[PDB]
Amino acid sequence: SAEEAQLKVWIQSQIHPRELFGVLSLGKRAAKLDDNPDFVQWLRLVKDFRANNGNQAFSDLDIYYLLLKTNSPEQLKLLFETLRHTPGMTKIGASMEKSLSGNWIRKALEQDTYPTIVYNTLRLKDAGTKLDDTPMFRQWLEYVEKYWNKNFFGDTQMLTLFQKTMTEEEDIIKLVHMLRNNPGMKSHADKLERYLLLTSESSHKTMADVWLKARETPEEVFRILRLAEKQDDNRMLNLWLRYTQTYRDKIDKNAFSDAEALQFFRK
């Protein structure tokens, strides 16, 4: 058999699966079992390479983060389901699904493990701009929320991890504004939004575009910036007024005018 002999060649050669993944150009297309015999063969090599060298030689996460570069978390979830229910592939599919299930928070919670450590046990830096779509990231948000309700790990240190995961500020801003949707994080996200706005001029234009795309009301933004608290020489006030006029221009035509906004602020 042509496929059976090719597999032998790779095994005898001791070629590393990352190297083979590259030369077979499996990054150029969807990781599916249909119309992709090169991928199926690649899995067969991975299987054998693990048996002969141990799982750490090419881990679940090595596999996950390689495929994540050119497939979505949702595709990979369905992929591992299919492997778990394909004869010959059941062991590895189940290994992957176990590695991505979340069955570590209870045993790791009580243990009192620093989120930073867990963040890099999970190798979330390797997720890149896909971070906020990965299930493991969502799981880590659970372990942080629970770690806080116990007893120290702070909002700035969380932001540091995000910045060592992806380089572009626009990606960092969209990420933090997506955390608003997670209630219980909404508190800390809003704080990070302010921290960026007070430490980076480039953030202002980007942040205003993110709110505008999300159709956020002037009232909501006023709430994020916490302008009701104690403070015409105020950078945050100017920013809010500029967002408000953009909102009035692009979305409502009937929101706060300049005068009305200033009145709202006086309260």
Q: 3-state SS string over the chain? A: CHHHHHHHHHHHHCCCHHHHHHHCCHHHCCCCCCCCHHHHHHHHHHHHHHHHHCHHHHCHHHHHHHHHCCCCHHHHHHHHHHHHCCCCCHHHHHHHHHHCCCCCHHHHHHHCCCHHHHHHHCCHHHHHHHHHHCHHHHHHHHHHHHHHCCCCCCHHHHHHHHHCCCCCHHHHHHHHHHHCCCCCCHHHHHHHHHHHHCCCCHHHHHHHHHHHHCCCCHHHHHHHHCCCCCCCCCHHHHHHHHHHHHHHHHHHCCCCCHHHHHHHHCC
Yes or no: say if 247 and 255 are a contact pair by the CB < 8 Å rule: yes
Residues after which the chain is discontinuous, using a C–N cutoff of 2.5 Å: 151, 231
Residue 170 in tokens: 């626009």
Contacts of 29 (CB under 8 A, 6+ apart): 36, 70
Resolution (in Å) of the shown entry? 2.9
Give me the residue label for tokens 């100017």: 238
What determination technique applies here? X-ray
In this structure, the chain runs to a length of: 267
Cβ-contact 71, 27 below 8 angstroms: no
Please give the single-letter amino acid code of residue 92: I
- Nearest residue to 100 via CA among 138, 57, 148: 138
